[PDB]
Design a protein around this ligand. Structure first.
Ligand code: ZN
Ligand code: ZN
Lengths: 50, 210, 108, 50, 149
């Protein structure tokens, strides 16, 4: 029983699997900024919009 | 709208006082205990604010069930703030016929000199006080208040002979406790406490009052 | 407000005169006749209406996962991560919340 | 010499020597444990009423 | 002019902030009123909230309002509520014995330097807790007998 550097390695289909998720996350994150700027994000719980 | 809430608050404390006089051991009929609002309005009217349902009529006489020739007086002061002579004339109005135990249900804050004068003398006449605001809910069955029962000395001696201990060994409880002031127990008395549980059953505990 | 005297430079306080009140001061002789109307209007900060906190509406904000809970066999559940120092070495624990008709909270 | 509690816990059981989350012992586990360690084929079965 | 806002018009000066919590179930909805104050005697004696079903966090105030026997139960629930928030597990009688240790003699006594002097009556064990010579000289002044037990 042993471990090497080959066990922990990025997969071929794994590099583009998380790339699209990170891109969608950033595309959803850079919109809430302008939403807060112009005025959006109707908050249900009592708190600050920030 | 305020008078309706006042009538409800006074009916609530009347019901708590009746429940207390009932589970204390006095003879209280059930019809007066679980009195409806429609039945309560038939004996005392709602309007005006301080007219027909005056504190002069709010004065009931409780009958002890064990001893026939034993009755307790209980009433409410007319003015909100308690005085010195207003309670003197009342305890002398209570002292005159056949009564030695009286209860005053105080409406607003109290007077320290009045408390001192009441606690000085206690040969046979004893005056106990109860705030109106605190007497708005039953404290015996609230959420987690274990059932308490006043015992007798013939069982106190048997309990002492059971575990072979003294009265000092028995854990003592305060006399200014809401439950202790509710049941009205003096020094040198044991209370039985029933503690229920949802896993095994209910346990029995014994306590002393100081 | 804040009003000062032009002669000396100190402040004035309203006092009573012979027939009517007057603006006077105790530093130099100076009296101002009170006229038709002087008034100051203030706007204290008003209070708003409080919001109802708690409920599933706020719970939809945090995102859940798909893992069964052994209480009522329900796959829907919320998972959170937390850092805790154990006795031997660092250990990352998960808080589990059941989103169902029972609604339990576990920490494994 | 003052007594604290009349019975430790309510029943006088050591929390260390216990079997299941507060319990003295599990009875179904002991049941199907003794069910297999003592097989008695010759002895017949009986109903609930007896 | 600066105390007109300070003058309270309604409510209890003790309670500061209140919010309502929504509980959901199979088909039923419930509304629970949690407030942040200390005087429970005033909030529980209200027309709105049911005085029967109400739980508090202050042990001293709940033993002042409900009683000393009702304070030994709320002090066990708070401890168990803190142990299940950490992913740990303790036995029920382990904390039941600790709750009965500060409930048998008088009121809810705390485990401090002053409460330990009310619980135990040995000057030698307090000699390490206290300071230079105060208790040591007051013992010789008064002249009490220490029991070696
Ligand atoms: Zn000037
Ligand atoms: Zn569940």
């Amino acid at each position: 029983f042993s471990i090497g550097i080959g066990d922990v390695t990025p997969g071929q289909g794994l590099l583009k699997a998380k790339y699209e998720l990170l891109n969608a996350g950033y595309k959803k994150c850079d919109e809430y900024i302008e939403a807060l700027n112009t005025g959006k994000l109707q908050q249900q719980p009592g708190c600050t919009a920030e | 709208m305020d008078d309706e809430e006042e009538t409800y608050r006074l009916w609530k404390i009347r019901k708590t006082i009746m429940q207390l006089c009932h589970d204390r051991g006095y003879l209280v009929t059930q019809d007066e205990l679980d009195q409806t609002l429609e039945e309560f309005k038939a004996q005392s009217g709602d309007k005006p604010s301080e007219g027909r349902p005056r504190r002069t009529d709010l004065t009931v006489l409780v009958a002890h069930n064990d001893d026939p020739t034993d009755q307790m007086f209980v009433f409410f002061p007319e003015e909100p703030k308690v005085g010195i002579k207003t309670i003197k004339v009342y305890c002398q109005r209570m002292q005159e016929e056949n009564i030695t135990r009286a209860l005053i249900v105080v409406q607003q804050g109290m007077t320290p000199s009045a408390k001192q004068s009441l606690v000085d003398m206690a040969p046979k006449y004893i005056l106990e006080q109860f705030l109106q605001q605190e007497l708005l809910i039953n404290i015996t069955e609230h959420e987690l208040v274990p059932e308490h029962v006043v015992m007798t000395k013939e069982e106190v001696t048997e309990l002492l002979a059971r575990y072979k201990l003294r009265e000092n060994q028995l854990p003592r409880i305060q006399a200014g406790d809401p439950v202790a002031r509710y049941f009205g127990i003096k020094r040198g008395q044991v209370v039985k406490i029933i503690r229920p549980s949802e896993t095994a059953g209910r346990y029995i505990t014994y306590r002393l009052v100081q | 407000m804040l009003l000062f005297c032009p002669g000396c430079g100190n402040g004035l306080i309203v006092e009573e005169g012979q027939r009517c009140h007057r603006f006077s001061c105790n530093t130099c002789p100076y009296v101002h006749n009170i006229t038709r109307k002087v008034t100051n209007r203030k706007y204290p900060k008003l209070k708003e209406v409080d919001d109802v906190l708690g409920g599933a509406a706020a719970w939809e904000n945090v995102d859940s996962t798909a893992e069964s809970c052994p209480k009522c066999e329900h796959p829907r559940a919320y998972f959170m991560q937390l850092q805790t120092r154990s006795a031997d070495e660092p250990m990352t624990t998960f808080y589990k919340c059941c989103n169902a008709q029972c609604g339990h909270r576990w920490r494994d | 010499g003052d007594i604290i509690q009349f019975i430790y816990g309510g029943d006088g059981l050591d929390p260390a020597a216990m079997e299941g989350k507060d319990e003295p012992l599990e009875f179904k586990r002991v049941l199907d444990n003794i069910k297999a360690v003592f097989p008695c084929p010759s002895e017949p079965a009986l109903s609930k009423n007896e | 002019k600066e105390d007109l806002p300070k003058v309270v018009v309604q409510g209890i000066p003790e309670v500061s902030r209140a919010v309502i919590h929504i509980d959901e179930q199979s088909g039923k909805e419930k509304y629970k009123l949690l407030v942040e104050g200390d005087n429970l005697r005033a909030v529980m004696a209200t027309h709105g909230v049911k005085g029967t079903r109400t739980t508090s966090n202050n042990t001293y105030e709940v033993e002042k309002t409900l009683g000393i026997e009702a304070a030994r139960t709320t002090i066990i629930n708070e401890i168990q509520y803190t142990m299940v928030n950490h992913g740990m597990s303790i036995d029920r009688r382990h904390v039941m014995l600790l709750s009965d240790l500060m409930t048998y003699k008088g009121e809810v006594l705390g485990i401090t330097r002053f409460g330990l002097a009310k619980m135990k009556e040995s000057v030698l064990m307090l000699a390490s807790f206290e300071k230079t010579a105060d208790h040591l000289f007051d013992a010789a002044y008064f002249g009490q007998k220490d029991s070696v037990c």
